[PDB]
Design an enzyme around this catalytic site. Structure first.
Site, PDB file in Angstrom:
ATOM      1  N   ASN A 141      27.513-114.268  16.736  1.00  0.00           N
ATOM      2  CA  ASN A 141      27.626-112.893  16.273  1.00  0.00           C
ATOM      3  C   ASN A 141      26.846-111.900  16.942  1.00  0.00           C
ATOM      4  O   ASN A 141      25.809-112.170  17.477  1.00  0.00           O
ATOM      5  CB  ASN A 141      27.320-112.767  14.736  1.00  0.00           C
TER       6      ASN A 141
ATOM      7  N   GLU B  78       9.874-110.758  13.483  1.00  0.00           N
ATOM      8  CA  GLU B  78      11.100-110.762  14.729  1.00  0.00           C
ATOM      9  C   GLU B  78      11.358-109.516  15.291  1.00  0.00           C
ATOM     10  O   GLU B  78      11.388-108.681  14.702  1.00  0.00           O
ATOM     11  CB  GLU B  78      12.241-111.666  14.074  1.00  0.00           C
TER      12      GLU B  78
ATOM     13  N   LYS C 226      16.188-108.821   6.447  1.00  0.00           N
ATOM     14  CA  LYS C 226      16.129-107.596   7.527  1.00  0.00           C
ATOM     15  C   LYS C 226      15.261-106.373   6.755  1.00  0.00           C
ATOM     16  O   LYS C 226      15.421-106.019   5.828  1.00  0.00           O
ATOM     17  CB  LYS C 226      17.608-106.951   7.606  1.00  0.00           C
TER      18      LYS C 226
ATOM     19  N   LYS D 131      15.125-115.438   6.174  1.00  0.00           N
ATOM     20  CA  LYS D 131      14.944-114.313   6.931  1.00  0.00           C
ATOM     21  C   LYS D 131      15.509-113.092   6.147  1.00  0.00           C
ATOM     22  O   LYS D 131      16.740-113.365   5.966  1.00  0.00           O
ATOM     23  CB  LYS D 131      15.072-114.471   8.469  1.00  0.00           C
TER      24      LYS D 131
ATOM     25  N   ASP E  61      12.862-109.385  10.115  1.00  0.00           N
ATOM     26  CA  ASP E  61      13.602-109.077  11.221  1.00  0.00           C
ATOM     27  C   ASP E  61      13.839-107.584  11.277  1.00  0.00           C
ATOM     28  O   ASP E  61      14.841-107.135  10.683  1.00  0.00           O
ATOM     29  CB  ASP E  61      14.675-109.969  11.577  1.00  0.00           C
TER      30      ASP E  61
ATOM     31  N   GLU F 241      16.454-113.248  21.067  1.00  0.00           N
ATOM     32  CA  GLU F 241      17.941-113.443  20.850  1.00  0.00           C
ATOM     33  C   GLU F 241      18.577-112.492  21.708  1.00  0.00           C
ATOM     34  O   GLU F 241      19.842-112.710  22.017  1.00  0.00           O
ATOM     35  CB  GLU F 241      18.290-113.063  19.492  1.00  0.00           C
TER      36      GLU F 241
ATOM     37  N   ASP G 236      19.649-117.759  23.013  1.00  0.00           N
ATOM     38  CA  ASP G 236      20.810-118.048  22.412  1.00  0.00           C
ATOM     39  C   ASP G 236      21.710-118.861  23.674  1.00  0.00           C
ATOM     40  O   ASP G 236      22.100-118.003  24.364  1.00  0.00           O
ATOM     41  CB  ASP G 236      21.416-116.947  21.325  1.00  0.00           C
TER      42      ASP G 236
ATOM     43  N   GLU H 232      18.852-121.269  13.802  1.00  0.00           N
ATOM     44  CA  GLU H 232      18.952-120.439  12.870  1.00  0.00           C
ATOM     45  C   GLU H 232      20.544-120.983  12.000  1.00  0.00           C
ATOM     46  O   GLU H 232      21.248-121.633  12.930  1.00  0.00           O
ATOM     47  CB  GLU H 232      19.453-118.989  13.558  1.00  0.00           C
TER      48      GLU H 232
HETATM   49 MG   LIG Z   1      16.864-110.689  15.416  1.00  0.00          MG
END
Ligand SMILES: [Mg+2]
Ligand SMILES: [Mg+2]
Lengths: 388, 388
Positions: free
Chosen positions: B54, B238, B183, B181, B212, B264, B291, B340
């Site tokens: 995503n 993050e 946001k 995790k 993050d 990422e 990733d 993840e």
């Molecule tokens: Mg991130």
């Protein structure tokens, strides 16, 4: 009323058996874009045009799906300047960049860049000024119609010998080019030497030569070529190693005193900033070749110029890759060092308005509205065919 | 005979109004790819599957017009291993990367990465082994099916309050996760602090929390949040600033002793190398989140792992972003730190095979051939619908 009524695109093939140390242009393509507005000037609707430079391929898919869409779907009243009488380039840019995560600057940078080209073309046309004049104005400086240009070629071609290489170069000099560039790293070092010596002899004292390794070399190979290249009075040694191996570029300064160049494959102000932070390039003699057409356009290029400012570099150190008129306009308006040119390659895309020629490695920008694509009949034919 | 007969793609929606500090997933999509071969195992033709993580959108255009073609236009005999009884992942990779200029690692890195996923899936299936077992073998090491996984969520949602945030997290713990995790940076710093205290309150001593910022912060904001965040026993902080602002990341070490993570949004071994060269991260406690699905696949990920070796980093410091099974396989086979997971979002694209459950932040890879997509009925349904 100021509104972008449509954003059309058409993929055009610019492929030949041409080859450099990294790729061949067998399947090369490019995107021709048109930003159709509802504003009327001269009893004719104003339409902005643009296309992306060679090397990265067309971006039809991205232009349709993610960017052409975000514009057309945006509230037209929110993409205008204070006066509301013209489009605000930055607002349009921001519009097409919503919901785009950071990093990953490639491909989409070409799509946005090529759309951006058209947007600025339209804006200048709506303002009734040549893009380069409008740019200088916005920056509070005086533009300079004279722009340095060099001929880029010298590709590896099946069955092409020293004879032809020579011919190609002479052909450029005949056109008024005082600076030619050529591909290396595509042959053994010694065979390359012979190809380099062949051109130095052909151009004699009427022109200077630049070599381009297209970022194919590793550190040792880059150094080997450096030791060989430094014995000749070259104009510049371009993209020695990978575009992102800043450490490699920095290590080269110890073996190559002469000017070096790179940047055509860095597509964001963030990537440009990293080159200036870690590349160890010499600001008094090296050249930055960032191409706005492949790097989110002029709106982004302005941020890159700001990065140069923060690191003590002069905009005159910039000679954009791409060989397109958008660069010619930015160069003339903001004082870049010059622009790349491809006399017999990727035509009609690129080049100069019909008439004006290369006299002493320079051309003079005619006062045409916008980018000036209309001045080049064979190119404009393609553009008005897309949208009018 | 080992021919890759077809490469089919189809774009799948994975949109919702979930939001992070930088983007909202309103128009988010992903590409589902199938690599159809002519090899038969179990009386059924072997087909490789893959899809991209995503955040970067689907790449149907690129897959169609540039990569699937090359792979199909190649000589089947030149894409096989020594024995000629199976496909050589690297040869297929090289095949689709011909005529691709350096730099610009974005978009096409997602296309190639997702095709690469399918290619390896096929290869493992043709070899009759689970991808992770085949990987360990190729590296001369013993694979390990026990893989650490953490639940990623805590998005900003219209009308979502502390109550719901709490619920979401508890939901993850109920499924066995011991690391979640959330946001941050999508609201005021003091509002965000409340959200964290709540989540901490909710998980108590049964789990650890990771925040993050999605690379939204500038240096000062990053430091402000660092001073606020450091008072809590967080698992990790993050992507503080822009993915490419290595200097920013480095400056953070002075204000944040606790583990940090990023990566990422870096999609090439070259970009990963720059992070290790200039990011100033701590190899004993930080995490690299590259990733493979968005970074030219496992063929490229292996080069990135080689970069880690060159810089003294352990592969156990890697916890790929994406929450997909390809990563689970790479983790189990090459000894990554974990993977993840998105228990609620983007389904059915992610997750584990039907039946496998999360025990104390871990799952155990069942011995399914290839990536193991077949084990997840709701996902495989979609895949066999694309090609069979
Ligand atoms: Mg991130
Ligand atoms: Mg070059």
């Amino acid at each position: 009323s100021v509104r972008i009524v449509d954003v059309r695109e058409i993929t055009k093939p610019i492929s030949s058996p041409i080859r450099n140390a990294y790729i061949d242009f067998t399947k090369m393509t490019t995107s021709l874009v048109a930003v159709v507005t509802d504003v009327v000037r001269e009893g004719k609707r104003v339409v902005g045009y643009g296309f992306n430079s060679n090397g990265r391929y067309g971006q039809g898919g991205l232009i349709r799906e993610r960017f052409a869409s975000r514009i057309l779907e945006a509230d037209p009243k929110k993409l205008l300047n204070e006066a509301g009488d013209n489009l605000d380039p930055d607002k349009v840019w921001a519009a097409m960049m919503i919901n785009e995560k950071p990093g990953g600057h490639g491909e989409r940078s070409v799509a946005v860049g090529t759309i951006d080209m058209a947007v600025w073309d339209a804006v200048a046309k709506i303002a009734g000024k040549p893009l380069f004049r409008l740019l200088a104005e916005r920056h509070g400086v005086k533009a300079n119609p004279r722009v340095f240009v060099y001929a880029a070629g010298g590709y590896y071609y099946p069955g092409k010998g020293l004879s032809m290489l020579r011919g190609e170069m002479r052909g450029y000099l005949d056109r008024g080019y005082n600076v030619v560039k050529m591909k290396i790293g595509g042959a053994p070092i010694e065979e390359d030497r012979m190809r380099i010596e062949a051109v130095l002899e052909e151009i004699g004292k009427d022109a200077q030569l630049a070599v381009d390794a297209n970022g194919r070399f590793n550190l040792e190979t880059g150094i080997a070529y450096a030791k060989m290249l430094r014995d000749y009075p070259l104009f510049w040694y371009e993209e020695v190693g990978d575009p992102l191996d800043y450490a490699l570029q920095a290590a080269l300064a110890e073996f190559y005193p002469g000017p070096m160049a790179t940047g055509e494959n860095l597509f964001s102000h963030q990537d440009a900033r990293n080159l200036l932070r870690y590349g160890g390039m010499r600001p008094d003699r090296d050249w930055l070749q960032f191409d706005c057409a492949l790097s989110y356009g002029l709106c982004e290029y302005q941020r890159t110029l700001e990065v140069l400012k923060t690191h003590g570099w002069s905009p005159s150190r910039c000679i954009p890759h791409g060989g397109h008129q958008m660069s010619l306009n930015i160069a003339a308006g903001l004082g870049l060092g010059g622009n790349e040119s491809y006399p017999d390659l990727f035509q009609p895309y690129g080049g100069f308005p019909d008439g004006v020629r290369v006299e002493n490695g320079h051309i003079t920008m005619p006062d045409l509205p916008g980018i000036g694509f209309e001045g080049k009949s064979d190119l404009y034919k393609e553009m008005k065919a897309l949208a009018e």
